[PDB]
From a paper:
The glucagon-like peptide-1 receptor (GLP-1R) is a member of the class B family of peptide hormone G protein–coupled receptors (GPCRs). The hallmark structural and functional feature of these receptors is a large N-terminal extracellular domain (ECD). The ECD is a globular structure forming trilayer α-β-βα folds that are stabilized by three conserved pairs of cysteine disulfide bonds. These domains play a critical role in class B receptor activation by recognizing the ligand in the initial binding event.
To investigate the receptor-binding mechanism of LY3502970, cryo-EM was used to determine the structure of the GLP-1R bound to the compound in complex with heterotrimeric GsiN18, camelid antibody Nb35, and single-chain variable fragment scFv16 at a global nominal resolution of 3.1 to 3.2 Å, with well-defined density for each transmembrane (TM) helix, LY3502970, and the majority of the ECD. In the cryo-EM structure, the receptor is in an active conformation, exhibiting typical active-state class B GPCR structure features on the intracellular side, similar to other GLP-1R/G protein complex structures. However, the binding mode of LY3502970 is unique, resulting in a distinct conformation of the ECD and the extracellular portion of the 7TM segments. The compound binds high in the helical bundle, interacting with residues within the ECD, TM1, TM2, TM3, ECL2, and TM7 but having no interactions with TM4, TM5, and TM6. In addition to the extensive hydrophobic and aromatic interactions, 4H-1,2,4-oxadiazol-5-one (yellow shading) of LY3502970 forms strong hydrogen bonds with Lys1972.67. Indeed, the cryo-EM structure reveals aromatic and hydrophobic interactions between the indole-tetrahydropyran branch (green shading and the connecting moiety) of LY3502970 and Trp33ECD, which forms a lid over this branch of the compound. The Trp33ECD lid is further stabilized through hydrogen bonding with Thr298ECL2 of ECL2 and van der Waals interactions with Gln221ECL1 of ECL1 and the disulfide bonding between Cys226ECL1 and Cys296ECL2. In the structure presented here, the ECD is oriented toward ECL1. Another interesting feature is that the extracellular end of TM1 forms a kink from Leu1411.36, which is a conformation not observed in any other GLP-1R structure, suggesting it is the result of the unique binding mode of LY3502970. Together, the conformation of Trp33ECD, the preceding N terminus of the ECD, and the kink conformation of the extracellular end of TM1 form a lid to partially bury LY3502970 in the GLP-1R helical bundle.
Numbering used by the authors:
A (entry chain G): 5 to 63
B (entry chain R): 28 to 56, 61 to 128, 135 to 339, 344 to 421
C (entry chain N): 1 to 128
D (entry chain A): 12 to 48, 51 to 59, 207 to 252, 263 to 304, 307 to 365, 368 to 394
E (entry chain E): 2 to 121, 124 to 235
F (entry chain B): 2 to 340
């Protein structure tokens, strides 16, 4: 009942500290994610299949 | 009657040897005392009609004792030939005319179709336990070379009866029989027969190995999987060799003829029949003990007729326990012709046993069907 | 967000009746099975009742067989507990608690006042 | 073609040989989980872990007393265990309904569905004297409609009310165990108290290993 | 951390000895062990190799049959049984620790060795220079050449570089042509390609004058160079 | 009561946070990623199979050289694997047989593990005395360890099943800081690329973005609806993906502070247990309990690939730092490596 209200006070403190942040709009953030995936789509060997000449798991 | 051409050419060998060892001390008597490999001839006389019996090496030999093949050599030294040739008058109207390739041909086709379907079912089972790699364990390895042993015994039986089909086909049009007599005289025949006896003993001891492996899963809680697996492979393959090759050499030393297949002194066939009987008896002991364990588990489970029936009926072909109903040698089935139906059902169950274990230990095992379902879903 | 807002309950006459409820929001209510859990004053939390996903399989604790009845409205996404003939040992704080996994039967949700898929609960008092 | 990589493959083969030796010592050891709400100082006579040996069989006991009561994530790790030795105070408030729910959640959890449960009911003399001077019937109205099974052996010395309550708790655990089970794992109840309970754990574990070996030959 | 060899002295030719190597300070049973000798006024050359668990034993061609290496893994002890000695087997013998896993650093620890004197194809590592004069401070670079491309298929150029200070056990400098060993200061560096190799002590300072050996490790028998000496 | 007005204030604060998230929610990621081409049927296939363990493999972590890989199994073994040539390097016996996590250091020198023994043990690989030794035995958590990741060579972050993550200094042996604020067991954590603010998914369906140099939960994400079993940061450190027992993955964004994409499917009724991204950040790999894994498209939310294979449930999953392969580890004692 006192540990409960101390837990409640720190929960309300955490929500005050977490509410008071700036938030980039979801269209801009998802545009940034899409731009990161499109910029680095050339480097990953999973969606671009790297051939057996330099894929080190093919014997 | 129960006489075939195999023992007929054995008797023809014996006939030639005793007739040779008799006619090499014939007194002087105008035909000579020649042996035309079909009939003996004594010291012939000019203008004499020798009326001798039918030679006893024939299959129909006991059928005509009252008759007599009779041939008359003239004073011109050669008998009533068909034309200008050296053949004497060897006329066989007195000796004129049941073999096991006719009397049991229904039995033949049923046990060879049993071994054929078992050979197919076991080669599919060996593929379905090797080519999945999730099914690999000690238990499936014991089952796996058990399956290989059923394959090897069925191949023994195939090579046996097909080889006799080829040999009776290649000597049915002939009478000189020479490659057969030199075949049984050869050691290649004895090596092939020893290989077949090894296949038989290996199948019975792999049934014994399956029994002792299931027993040591149930009873011996303390065991090594690795060392006792190597030990069970050794018991399965080498111990049949360990009593087959002493049998082979003692038959090589002491009853050499017949291509090792006459077994007159019953001790010699007895020393190859006893360890197989030991497999069957010990395996019945394990069958009784395992079914007693299953009955204990069911009456302790805090409707059992179906489960006991399913347990015993899936355990019998795995352990070969069915041969216990004729492991006792009675020899009194020759009254009411039940010996034929006894031999029928015993070769029939021995033929189908490989099919029964291939369907009860791969094709309805839930883990193999789980591997089918999961390899079909990841195949789509 | 897993949210379990309870409703109903307070002072009530012994022998009387009551019906308390839990509006469950933030999750597909049909995939989970639900429980009522109670905590007597002083005593720890104890289980009261289970209702399954379709509401078919149903369970109560020993002490309240016949006296209580649990039900669920998957359409309204809510969980009802109809209590009848309440006794003075049945005063407690009541909790709607969902079992943590979807599509399963097992539940692990009566823990030492730390199980986050459990609402704040209502005081229900039987006195005179 | 493996210049000094040959020596690395030879090192790996020695690693595989040592792991083969560890496999031989691993499957010869029976892991079992003591889970309750003493029964443990009667075992080391011959803090989490325990390795003991009965009839030259290595048993391996892990106690989970140093965790929290949220059990749902760390109990998955015991799916390869051989048995969960479940301990319930047979005179438990009503802690034993919590014990029934814990057993049911053990029994139905989709990774513990191959795990048999060795069920120990401690404090049976406490239940005996509580029903003697009494309680349990207040918690359980289904106990009125209960009859002692005729095959249930009476422990010589105790009251018939003690037997009917005792075997009621046992058969009620059995009803919760067999309400949903494919025959893939069973429950082995006993009654402790003092002497060596470990013989029952030995016999039980042998029963579990034998039933698993039997039903992996489709004999069950 | 500790290797002691034992069993030196002077032996008449044709005889037999046993060099012993007591190891203390590391788990002995998981190390390939090499015997590597040196003629008393010449450079090092390899003798023998027993692996971890004694399952792979290689010898040099000039001792193949005459010597026999074994090890007692409980006694942490290495054995070289030397039979039919010749005049050329007069050498300082060395017990070399060597582990072979991925990224491991073989030939990194070397015992004090023993003097064993007698009184009565392959990869050829061409060392570049007999001796080179050195003042402190500069970037002393010394080269080495192979008779066969040490670049394997997996990109592991199996060239090792060894400092030997005067009167000291020859310690490892560089394993696999580019990697510094543990405890080696940063001033050392290694470079090159197949059959073209370069050790470089940029920013030289003292406690560095020694003979630098150039070990092939692409295939047995492991051959060294003649060694390049630094001076003052 | 005063507890009641604090709960009223906390409810007003949830309202304010939900309003702020709603105000910045103009177009979902499914909307503005229609104009992108999909990936297609990705026939990833088993390349190596690391068949060495005795019990179930409970965790795995790749090296940063993309070749070595630690697998921790519950037979008491933790063995480094050379993936390129499928041979072992070390085989470390543990103290407690129940390890639930492992971690390969980015320097390659140490390997952490930990489990029901409530202790993160740090083994030293590069010692000059031969065999591996337990270099540090960090014991301050009160519940089981669930995940652990090295920040660098010197300090390790752990998460436990007593609602706490913790930053530990290894050279001293105690917690530099704690991270409290969860209400359930913290099943996993995932570092950022810059290793300055990590996330933790827990058993209260809430993922927290912490700050390592402070110790405060700066952001808190509530999209899921069951215990979060895995978490993985997106390769630029602006987003992260989670997965739970609710059979879904969820891509959250840190700066947008809310859930962006919910990767679910009708045939998926099993909980999921291990997530990782590819190097581009396009394939969200996610290992499930139905013995499969799924290669989701992080922008189309389509099942681009389905990793077949394992015969018991996959339990851990890790993509190399050069993105070359994906290693899965299951409860059938086998590691699979996929390209
Ligand atoms: C149908 C049937 C037949 C028989 N039966 N009874 C007999 C025989 C056969 N018998 C076996 C195969 N055939 C046979 C022959 C030609 C056939 C067919 C069908 N179509 N065609 C065209 C056919 F079925 C055959 O007649 C043979 C003729 N015999 C032998 O003494 C005989 C010859 C023989 C030759 C070889 C080997 C040694 C090494 O090299 C070899 C060349 C391989 C010979 C191995 C064993 C042999 N034995 C035995 C045998 N007794 O039974 C077997 O199986 N063996 C006693 C030993 C166990 C007379 C008694 C028995 C049963 C229970 C049965 F149901």
């Amino acid at each position: 009942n006192t540990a409960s209200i101390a837990q409640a006070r720190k929960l309300v403190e955490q929500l005050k500290m977490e509410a008071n942040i700036d938030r980039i709009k979801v269209s801009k953030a998802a545009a940034d994610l899409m731009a990161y995936c499109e910029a680095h789509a050339k480097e990953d060997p999973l969606l671009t299949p790297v051939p057996a000449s330099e894929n080190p798991f093919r014997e | 009657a129960t006489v075939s051409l195999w023992e007929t050419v054995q008797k023809w060998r014996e006939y030639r040897r005793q007739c040779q060892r008799s006619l090499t001390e014939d007194p002087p008597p105008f035909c000579n005392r020649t042996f035309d490999e079909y009939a003996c001839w004594p010291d012939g006389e000019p203008g004499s009609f020798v009326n001798v019996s039918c030679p006893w090496y024939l299959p129909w030999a006991s059928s005509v004792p009252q008759g007599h093949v009779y041939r008359f050599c003239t004073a011109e030294g050669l008998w009533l030939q068909k034309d200008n040739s050296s053949l004497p008058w060897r006329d066989l109207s007195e000796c004129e005319e049941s073999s096991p390739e006719e009397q049991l041909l229904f039995l033949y086709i049923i046990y060879t179709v049993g071994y054929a379907l078992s050979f197919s079912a076991l080669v599919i089972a060996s593929a379905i336990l090797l080519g999945f790699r999730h099914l690999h364990c000690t238990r499936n390895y014991i089952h796996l070379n058990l399956f290989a042993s059923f394959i090897l015994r069925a191949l023994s039986v195939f090579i046996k009866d097909a080889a006799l089909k080829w040999m009776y086909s290649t000597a049915a049009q002939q009478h000189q029989w020479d490659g057969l007599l030199s075949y049984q005289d050869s050691l290649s025949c004895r090596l092939v027969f020893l290989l077949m006896q090894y296949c038989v003993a290996a199948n019975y001891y792999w049934l014994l190995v399956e029994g002792v492996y299931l027993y040591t899963l149930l009873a011996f809680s303390v065991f090594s999987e690795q060392w006792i697996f190597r030990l069970y492979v050794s018991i399965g393959w080498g111990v049949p060799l360990l009593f087959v090759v002493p049998w082979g050499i003692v038959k090589y030393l002491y009853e050499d003829e017949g291509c090792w297949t006459r077994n007159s002194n019953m001790n010699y066939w007895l020393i190859i029949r006893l360890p197989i009987l030991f497999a069957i008896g010990v395996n019945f002991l394990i069958f009784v003990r395992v079914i007693c364990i299953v009955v204990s588990k069911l009456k302790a489970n805090l409707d059992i007729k179906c489960r006991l029936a399913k347990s015993t009926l899936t355990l019998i072909p795995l352990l070969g326990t069915h041969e216990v109903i004729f492991a006792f040698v009675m020899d009194e089935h020759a009254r009411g012709t039940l010996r034929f139906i006894k031999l029928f059902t015993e070769l029939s169950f021995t033929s189908f046993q490989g099919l029964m274990v291939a369907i009860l230990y791969c094709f309805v095992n839930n883990e193999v069907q789980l591997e089918f379902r999961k390899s079909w879903e990841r195949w789509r | 967000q897993v949210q379990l807002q309870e409703s109903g309950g307070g002072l009530v006459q012994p022998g009387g009746s009551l019906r308390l409820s839990c509006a469950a929001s933030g999750f597909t209510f049909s995939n989970y099975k639900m429980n009522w859990v109670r905590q007597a004053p002083g005593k720890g939390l104890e289980w009261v009742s289970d209702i399954s996903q379709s509401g078919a399989s149903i369970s109560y604790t020993g002490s309240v067989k016949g006296r209580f009845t649990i039900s669920r409205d998957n359409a309204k996404n809510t969980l009802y507990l109809q209590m009848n003939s309440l006794k003075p040992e049945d005063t407690a704080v009541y909790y709607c608690a969902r079992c943590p996994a979807p599509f399963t039967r097992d539940c692990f949700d009566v823990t030492s006042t730390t199980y986050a898929y459990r609402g704040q609960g209502t005081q229900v008092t039987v006195s005179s | 073609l493996s210049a000094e990589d040959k020596a690395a493959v030879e090192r790996s083969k020695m690693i595989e040989k040592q792991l083969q030796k560890d496999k031989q010592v691993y499957r010869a050891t029976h892991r079992l989980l003591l889970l309750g709400a003493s029964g443990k100082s009667t075992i080391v006579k011959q803090i989490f872990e325990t390795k003991f040996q009965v009839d030259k069989v290595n048993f391996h006991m892990f106690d989970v007393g140093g965790q929290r009561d949220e059990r749902r994530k760390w109990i998955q790790c015991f799916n390869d265990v051989t048995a969960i030795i479940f301990v319930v105070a047979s005179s438990s408030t009503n802690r034993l309904q919590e014990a029934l729910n814990l057993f049911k959640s053990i029994w139905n959890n989709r990774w513990l569905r191959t795990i048999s449960v060795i069920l120990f009911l401690n404090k049976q003399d406490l239940l005996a004297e509580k029903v003697l001077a009494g309680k349990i019937e207040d918690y359980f109205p289904e106990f009125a409609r209960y009859t002692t099974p005729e095959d249930a052996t009476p422990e010589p010395g105790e009251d018939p009310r003690v037997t009917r309550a005792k075997y009621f708790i046992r058969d009620e655990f059995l009803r919760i165990s067999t309400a949903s089970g494919d025959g893939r794992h069973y429950c082995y109840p006993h009654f402790t108290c003092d002497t060596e309970n470990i013989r029952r754990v030995f016999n039980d574990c042998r029963d579990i290993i034998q039933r698993m070996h039997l039903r992996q030959y489709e004999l069950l | 951390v500790q290797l002691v060899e034992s069993g030196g002295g002077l032996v008449q030719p044709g005889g037999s000895r046993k060099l012993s190597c007591s190891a203390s300070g590391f788990a002995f049973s998981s190390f390939g062990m090499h015997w590597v000798r040196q003629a008393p006024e010449k450079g090092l050359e390899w003798v023998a190799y027993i692996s971890s668990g004694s399952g792979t034993i290689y010898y040099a061609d000039t001792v193949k049959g005459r010597f026999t290496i074994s090890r007692d893994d409980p006694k942490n002890t290495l054995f070289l049984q030397m039979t039919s000695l010749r005049s050329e087997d007069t050498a300082m013998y060395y017990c070399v620790r060597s582990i072979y896993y991925y990224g491991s650093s073989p030939f990194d620890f070397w015992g004090q060795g023993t003097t064993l004197t007698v009184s009565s194809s392959d990869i050829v590592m061409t060392q570049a220079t007999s001796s080179v004069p050195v003042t402190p401070g500069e970037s002393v670079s010394i080269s080495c050449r192979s008779s066969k491309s040490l670049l394997h298929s997996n990109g592991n150029t199996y060239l090792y570089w060894f400092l030997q200070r005067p009167g000291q056990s020859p310690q490892l400098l560089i394993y696999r042509m580019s990697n510094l060993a543990s405890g080696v200061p940063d001033r050392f560096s290694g470079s090159g390609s197949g059959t073209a190799f370069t050790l470089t002590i940029s920013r030289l300072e003292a406690e560095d004058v020694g003979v630098y050996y150039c070990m092939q490790h692409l295939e047995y028998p492991l051959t060294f160079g003649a060694g390049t000496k630094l001076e003052l | 009561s005063e507890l009641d007005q604090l709960r009223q204030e906390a409810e007003q604060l949830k309202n304010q946070i939900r309003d702020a998230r709603k105000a910045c929610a103009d177009a979902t990621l499914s909307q503005i990623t229609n104009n992108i081409d999909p990936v297609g049927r990705i026939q990833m296939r088993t390349r190596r199979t690391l068949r060495g363990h005795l019990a179930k493999i409970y965790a795995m972590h790749w090296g940063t050289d993309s070749r070595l890989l630690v697998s921790a199994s519950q037979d008491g073994k933790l063995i480094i694997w050379d993936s390129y040539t499928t041979n072992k390097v070390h085989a470390i016996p543990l103290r407690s047989s129940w390890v639930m996590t492992c971690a390969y250091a980015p320097s390659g020198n140490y390997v952490a593990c930990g489990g029901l023994d409530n202790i993160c043990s740090i083994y030293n690989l590069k010692t000059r005395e031969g065999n591996v030794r337990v270099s540090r035995e960090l014991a301050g958590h009160t519940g089981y360890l669930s995940c652990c990741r090295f920040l660098d060579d010197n300090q390790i972050v752990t998460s436990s099943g007593d609602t706490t993550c913790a930053l530990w200094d290894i050279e001293t042996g105690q917690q530099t800081t704690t991270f409290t604020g969860h209400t359930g067991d913290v099943m996993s954590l995932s570092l950022a690329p810059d290793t300055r603010l990590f996330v933790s998914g827990a058993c209260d369906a809430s993922a927290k973005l912490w700050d390592v140099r402070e110790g405060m939960c700066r952001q808190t994400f509530t999209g899921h609806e069951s215990d979060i079993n895995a978490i993985c940061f997106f390769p630029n450190g602006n987003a992260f993906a989670t997965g739970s027992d609710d059979a879904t993955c969820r891509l959250f964004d840190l700066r947008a502070d809310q859930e962006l994409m919910t990767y679910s499917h009708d045939n998926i009724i099993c909980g999921i247990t291990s997530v990782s991204f590819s190097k581009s950040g396009r394939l969200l790999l996610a290992g499930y309990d139905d013995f499969n894994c799924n290669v989701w498209d992080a922008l189309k939310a389509d099942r681009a690939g389905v990793l077949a294979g394992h015969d018991n449930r996959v339990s851990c999953l890790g993509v190399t730092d050069d993105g070359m392969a994906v290693a899965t580890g299951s409860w059938d004692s086998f590691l699979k490596i996929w390209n």
